[PDB]
């Protein structure tokens, strides 16, 4: 288990959610996709990411 700096993306693989993890102390080159089941101990960063997605969805809505 490693310290997480930020959550950068979200996707589904075979219908199951994953998130893109920037690891603290590692460069972005080593970012990895992880099952949402793996990130229970960084939900503040996951919430930050979710908040940003919603903000962008609201923008896409506005422009439509």
């Amino acid at each position: 288990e490693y310290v997480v700096e930020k959550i950068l993306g979200k996707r589904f693989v075979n219908g199951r959610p994953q998130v893109l993890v920037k690891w603290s102390g590692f460069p972005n080159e080593n970012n990895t996709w992880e099952p949402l089941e793996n990130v229970g101990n960084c939900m503040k960063l996951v919430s930050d990411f979710e908040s940003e997605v919603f903000r962008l969805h609201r923008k896409a809505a506005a422009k439509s």
Binding site: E1, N38, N41
Partner: peptide, 7 residues
């Protein structure tokens, strides 16, 4: 601390 398991 914010941590996660690495797969």
């Amino acid at each position: 601390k914010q941590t996660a398991r690495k797969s």
